[PDB]
Amino acid sequence: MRLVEIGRFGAPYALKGGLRFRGEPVVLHLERVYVEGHGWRAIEDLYRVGEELVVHLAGVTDRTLAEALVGLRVYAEVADLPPLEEGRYYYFALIGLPVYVEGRQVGEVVDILDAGAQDVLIIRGVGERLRDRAERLVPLQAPYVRVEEGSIHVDPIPGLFD
């Protein structure tokens, strides 16, 4: 199993326990989500209203139960996500993956950034110079980069991870 953050609940919507959901539209394809500090909750219903998305969780049947979950992070089990085509990735799911070079862990993905024509992994990890440690950048789609289910492997390019 592996949980990845897909969003956070906003304020309750209407009176039956529905909650605004702020985060990934992929939630529309799920049947359950793990709620921070509370455990799995089956999704009983969800829908769009204008540009918002509202989720109804099993057992969250009024505003009082809903308020207890406002602001909490929401997670998906990776195995639950619709499979993507080759060469495509769920960015939110890459966050937190350990990054290795020749089998030695050199850091972990903390975010993904845009550098015009390519998506770039932001990695926190090693470095001879302190300022290079927290913002090391590696192009996600580079041929010297290999994304696997639970880790990312990068070739020992000279001057990449110094």
Q: Is beta strand 152-154 parallel, antiparallel or unpaired with respect to 145-147?
A: antiparallel
C-alpha–C-alpha distance, residues 60 and 82, integer Å: 26
**Residues 75, 96 share a domain:** no
**Residues 127, 54 share a domain:** no
**Total structural domains within the chain:** 2
In a domain, 74, yes or no: yes
C-alpha–C-alpha distance, residues 8 and 6, integer Å: 7
**Residues 131, 98 share a domain:** yes
Phi, psi of 139 (to 5 degrees): -60, 125
What the block records as the tokens of 42 is 């089956």
| Residue 98: C-alpha distances to residues 8, 64, 70, 95 (Å) | 24, 39, 30, 9
**Residues 4, 80 share a domain:** yes
**Residues 78, 97 share a domain:** no
Smallest CA-to-CA distance from 75 within 96, 62, 91, 92 is with 92
Residue appearing with tokens 């509202």: 54
In a domain, 51, yes or no: yes
Which of 53, 84, 115 finishes a domain?
84
Beta strands in the chain (DSSP E): 3-12, 19-23, 32-35, 39-49, 52-57, 73-77, 98-101, 104-115, 118-125, 136-139, 145-147, 152-154
**Residues 95, 32 share a domain:** no
What the block records as the tokens of 6 is 């897909």
C-alpha–C-alpha distance, residues 27 and 81, integer Å: 9
C-alpha–C-alpha distance, residues 13 and 29, integer Å: 20
Which method resolved this structure?
Answer: X-ray
Which of 33, 58, 84 finishes a domain?
84
Residue appearing with tokens 């939630």: 27
In a domain, 161, yes or no: no
C-alpha–C-alpha distance, residues 147 and 159, integer Å: 21
C-alpha–C-alpha distance, residues 40 and 34, integer Å: 4
CATH code where residue 116 lies: 2.30.30.240
In a domain, 97, yes or no: yes
Instruction: Report DSSP letters for 100-113, one per residue.
Output: EETTEEEEEEEEEE
Residue appearing with tokens 């590696």: 138
Q: Is beta strand 152-154 parallel, antiparallel or unpaired with respect to 98-101?
A: parallel
Q: Note every long-range contact of 13-16, with CB atoms under 8 Å and residues 24 or more positions apart, other chains counting.
A: 13/49, 13/52, 13/54, 14/54, 15/62, 15/63, 16/56, 16/61, 16/62
Phi, psi of 32 (to 5 degrees): -155, 150
In a domain, 7, yes or no: yes
Domain assignment of residue 142, given as a range: 85-155
C-alpha–C-alpha distance, residues 114 and 58, integer Å: 38
Measured between alpha carbons, how far apart are the two ends of the chain, in Å? 33
Computed from CA positions of residues 64, 37, 89, 107, in that sequence, does the dihedral angle turn out positive or negative? positive
CATH code where residue 22 lies: 2.40.30.60
